[PDB]
């Protein structure tokens, strides 16, 4: 079939740089940064336990609840018990915040609490101070807002107003209450805060309260539980959680588990490899997960991420709420947390605890080996399952804090980093979420590890983070992670993708940051980039060049280091790189290297002149982006040498003159954006301030690549994608068109006198081009380009090509005719420009790319299969532009004084033919050397060859017709004409059809002869015919007279 031909055709000017506008992605407002770091410098422990005496308010039962801080006061005497309980509570709090000035109070008086709290506030005026109160041995707080403590003789409970309590305290403080009606305490505290606010007109959010109960509720009196329950949940969550689990009906599933066995559990809270440490780690992960999923982001950051002690207190407060809900008790906190007792992660906590302590009897008795709990592995499996179809921005995964927790240890660190990288690959929103959870400090600390397997995952994660948020450069420089990145970049064995990842990271670090630039200079980044400059990887070279450019941006020491290393000479090689992106990056780097001369010795002037003359040969460049970067580099040159450029400009109203000529060339650029930038740069020179400096968005546009996902399969490879189905339908339509055309041609050619339509144009139809498949004909006028249809018969579009009055659209072509077609329009001065969306309903005319070619009119011959483009005209040179590399590949010499009137080529062979004004028809073979490119030169005409077109068949027959009108069919293997014909004495225009041998000619007397290769008379249509065009597939012909009328003819 004819489908394989369409599929294996490169799509010229169809890439990211052509479709997407070259601009930087706007940086989002990254609020993941922690505003301030509070510290609990001191903790106050007020324990009004009243050991040995029961409060009158509550009549305790005979067994009662005698356990305070896991200590039985009645066994060891009153004073000794109180001291031991105070010490044990200090130890339990030190378990969470070891570095704090703990000052215990054992049954204190009002003045004693006054002195304690005032001294602590004087010690820490602006840092958090924890106040811990135990009202188990004193009467309940009253509605009036008072707290009961002891007098000197311990004969009566003297009250203590909460107003005075918070007057002695300060605004930065957290309060933990363990009383019966602690809700009354919280309500009175808030009422006093409101009273203070009312008085202030003529410390509410800052102070945090944790309360054991609501105002109405009473503490539980069950003998099994400790009397000190809320503090046991807050300070020793794992022990109380296991004790509470061993009291539920879930124990029935696991026989042989008792509180006596829990008392003898092995391991410590710190060693995560031990069962107790594993349980503590799992509890931390689950509580953090519940807090993250339930609480809002702002409250989660304020509570569970500000400081260690408050975060731990609230993580244990979740467990306190869950435990005390079952005893008709509701803990109260100053910021009202939404209820978390029903969260689904508590079931996972129960299952994990069950699995962990189901092995406990064997550990205790048989002394077996403790197998690690599969909790984290299963949670990471769930995270992976979410990521499998997590492309859509659905509800965020519940396992992000679990990923953060499992990042801490090394047992599953590599898998956690892999999953985190896969998640950050999803997009900027995923990176923002991960930074909001608080992975940044831990990923930053991970850079200290010397494990070589972590390097790819870490560089991937850091590249994503820096692509999203660029403010991390200061933190990376502070922690010396740039040393880690330099070590990554200096390993040839590393895969190239991670090396370009690290190159991007280093480019972002040094981006407009003098500290980072100096740090990387002292890290020998220049040499590292230079050694990896000629690497066979386009993106690696591009980002190495960008990093080199950003290193010496306003940095004279970096420029000196580059000069010593001959960085400019080595960077000159990238200016000829086939990839346009690398050329643009090299131009950016060279311009930035120029822009920081700062008046050094004559060697600096010489090297600036050398770089300028090396960049001044890059004007003849296909890529408008690279030319814009060249304009920016030349603007840097101008800023460096403003006085010399002013003198040069005033001279005409020898190095700077050449740069001025280059800028003038760039000013009259076909691409509007390059022309505008060059014009602005030139105007900045005449009136001679810093505001004239303009920076292009190429660097940020390149950095946008790392924001987009990379791992997932591209949309083109998707077989069931809509785009591929549309392309398949288009190719099916093209195959049908070709088959129908071949069937029509097989039936012969009858007389063609059918006039499909007759219209009027605003301008003279100069060149008419048929779209091969869709029913669109592109007619170019002097100052416009119309697109008519021969089915609907309506004017679709009316462009302005942009060429000046003297110029004229001479040649035209349809790039990518099979699908997603472009329109190439070459003016007679050299300007070649490509149009997109030229016949669309919901899209406006669009200019893809443009570049001044060369520098009869201008003749163009597109070659879709090889991707090359040959332009010719008045010059004695035939240029061969390659749209893939966007650079001129060959310039074969015409070797004749007359202009190239026509140009055509044979597919699958190098048989570039060219009609000439003098009459000769030269043929060129680009396989051989330039001096041997010329193959044959036969001169049997003296007139402008109207069209020396060629036949696509293997037996190519150059049908060359001059103004004299004498047809001479030539062959590439015979130096003499095979067939000679004479048609019209005065000929004006003609066209040839490759499939059907139909030579359509013009005439001054309105005649239009459509003859055959044999010269047989077929049709003499009676109406200067200056534009004829044949449909490449159908036997259609377009006739446009000197009058602005267009017609399309067909055979029945």
């Amino acid at each position: 079939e004819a489908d394989l031909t369409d599929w294996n055709l490169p799509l010229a000017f169809m890439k990211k740089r052509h479709c997407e506008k070259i601009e930087g992605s706007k940086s989002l407002a990254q609020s993941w940064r922690m505003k301030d770091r509070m510290k609990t410098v001191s903790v106050a422990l007020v324990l009004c336990l009243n050991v040995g005496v029961d409060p009158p308010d509550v009549v305790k039962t005979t067994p009662c609840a005698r356990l305070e801080c896991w200590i039985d006061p009645l066994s060891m005497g009153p004073q000794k018990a109180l001291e031991t309980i105070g010490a044990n509570l200090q130890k339990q709090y030190e378990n969470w915040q070891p570095r704090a000035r703990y000052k215990q109070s054992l049954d204190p008086t009002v003045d004693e609490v006054k002195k304690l709290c005032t001294s602590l506030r004087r010690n820490a005026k602006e840092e958090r101070v924890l106040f811990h109160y135990n009202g188990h041995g004193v009467p309940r707080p009253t509605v009036n807002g008072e707290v009961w403590v002891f007098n000197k003789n311990y004969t009566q409970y003297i009250p203590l107003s909460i107003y005075d309590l918070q007057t002695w305290m300060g605004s930065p403080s957290i309060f933990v209450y363990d009383c019966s009606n602690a809700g009354l305490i919280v309500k009175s505290f808030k009422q006093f805060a409101l009273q203070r606010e009312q008085e202030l007109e003529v410390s509410m959010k800052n102070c945090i309260q944790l309360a054991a109960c609501e105002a109405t509720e009473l503490l539980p009196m069950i003998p099994d539980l400790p009397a000190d329950l809320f503090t046991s949940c807050l300070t020793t969550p794992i022990k109380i959680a296991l004790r509470w689990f061993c009291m539920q009906k879930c124990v029935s599933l696991v026989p042989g588990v008792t509180l006596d066995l829990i008392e003898k559990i092995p391991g410590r809270l710190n060693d995560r490899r031990t069962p107790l440490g594993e349980l503590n780690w799992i509890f931390t992960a689950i509580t953090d997960t519940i807090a993250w999923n339930v609480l809002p982001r702002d409250l989660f950051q304020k509570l569970f991420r500000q400081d260690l002690l408050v975060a731990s207190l609230f993580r244990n407060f979740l467990l306190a709420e869950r435990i005390m809900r079952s005893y008709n008790c509701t803990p109260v906190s100053s910021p009202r947390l939404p209820p978390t007792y029903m969260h689904a992660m508590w079931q996972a906590w129960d299952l994990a605890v069950d699995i962990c302590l189901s092995q406990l009897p064997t550990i205790i008795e048989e002394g077996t080996a403790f197998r690690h709990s599969p909790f984290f592995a299963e949670q990471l499996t769930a995270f992976q399952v979410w990521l499998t179809m997590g492309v859509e921005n659905r509800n965020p995964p519940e396992q992000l804090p679990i990923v953060l927790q499992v990042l801490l240890s090394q047992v599953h660190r590599l898998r956690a980093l892999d999953l985190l990288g896969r998640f950050l690959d999803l997009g900027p929103w995923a990176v923002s979420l991960a930074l909001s959870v608080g992975i940044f400090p831990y990923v930053l600390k991970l850079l200290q590890s010397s494990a070589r397997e972590l390097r790819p995952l870490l560089v991937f994660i850091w590249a994503k983070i820096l692509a999203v948020d660029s403010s991390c450069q200061a933190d990376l420089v502070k922690d010396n992670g740039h040393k880690y990145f330099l070590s990554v970049l200096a390993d040839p064995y590393m895969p190239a993708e991670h090396r370009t990842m690290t190159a991007f990271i280093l480019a972002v670090i040094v981006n407009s940051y003098h500290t980072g630039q100096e740090a990387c200079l002292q890290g020998n980044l220049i040499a590292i980039c230079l050694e990896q400059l000629n690497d066979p990887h386009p993106l690696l070279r591009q980002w190495v060049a960008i990093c080199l450019g950003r290193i010496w941006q306003n940095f004279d020491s970096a420029r000196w280091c580059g000069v010593r290393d001959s960085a400019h000479e080595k960077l000159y090689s990238l200016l000829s790189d086939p990839i346009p992106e690398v050329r643009c990056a090299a131009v950016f780097a060279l311009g930035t290297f120029v822009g920081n001369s700062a008046e050094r010795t004559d060697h600096s002037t010489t090297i600036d002149h050398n770089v300028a003359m090396m960049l001044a040969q890059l004007v003849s460049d296909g890529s408008p982006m690279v030319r814009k970067e060249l304009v920016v580099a030349l603007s840097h040159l101008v800023v460096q040498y403003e006085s010399n450029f002013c003198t040069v400009a005033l001279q005409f109203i020898s190095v700077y003159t050449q740069i001025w000529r280059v800028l003038l060339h760039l000013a009259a650029d076909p691409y509007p954006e390059v022309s505008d930038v060059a014009m602005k740069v030139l105007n900045s020179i005449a009136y001679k301030f810093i505001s004239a400096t303009v920076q292009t968005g190429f660097c940020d546009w390149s950095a946008r690549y790392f924001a987009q996902p990379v791992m997932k399969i591209p949309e083109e490879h998707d077989l069931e994608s809509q785009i591929r189905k549309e392309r398949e339908w288009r190719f099916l339509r093209n195959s049908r068109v070709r088959r129908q055309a071949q069937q029509v041609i097989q039936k012969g050619i009858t007389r063609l006198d059918d006039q499909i339509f007759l219209n009027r144009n605003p301008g003279v139809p100069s060149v008419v081009k048929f779209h091969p498949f869709t029913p669109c004909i592109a007619v170019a006028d002097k100052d416009s380009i119309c697109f008519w249809d021969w089915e609907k018969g309506e004017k679709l579009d009316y462009f302005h090509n942009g060429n000046p009055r003297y110029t004229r659209v001479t040649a035209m072509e349809y790039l990518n005719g099979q699908d997603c077609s472009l329109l190439l329009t070459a003016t007679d001065d050299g300007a070649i420009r490509v149009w997109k969306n030229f016949a669309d309903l919901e899209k406006n005319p669009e200019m893809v790319t443009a570049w001044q070619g060369l520098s009869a009119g201008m003749v163009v011959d597109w070659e879709q299969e090889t991707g090359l483009l040959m332009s010719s005209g008045d010059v004695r040179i035939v240029r061969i532009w390659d749209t893939d590399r966007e650079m001129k590949v060959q310039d074969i010499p015409t070797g004749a004084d007359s202009c190239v009137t026509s140009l055509s080529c044979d597919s699958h062979r190098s048989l570039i033919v060219a009609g000439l004004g003098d009459g000769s028809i030269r043929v060129y073979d680009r396989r051989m050397a330039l001096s041997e490119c010329r193959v044959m030169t036969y001169r049997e005409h003296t007139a402008w060859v109207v069209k020396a077109s060629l036949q696509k068949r293997p037996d190519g027959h150059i049908v060359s017709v001059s103004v004299n009108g004498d047809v001479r069919i030539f062959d590439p293997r015979m130096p003499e004409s095979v067939n000679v014909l004479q048609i019209v004495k005065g000929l004006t225009a003609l066209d040839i059809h490759p499939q059907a041998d139909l030579i359509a000619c013009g005439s001054v007397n309105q005649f239009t002869a459509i003859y055959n290769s044999s010269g047989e008379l077929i049709n003499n249509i009676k109406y200067a015919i200056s534009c004829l065009a044949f449909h490449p597939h159908w036997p259609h012909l377009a006739v446009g007279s000197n009058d602005y009328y267009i017609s399309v003819y067909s055979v029945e």
Partner: peptide
């Protein structure tokens, strides 16, 4: 830091 990253070299 809120948590304790261990085994970091």
């Amino acid at each position: 830091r809120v948590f304790f990253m261990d085994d970091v070299e």
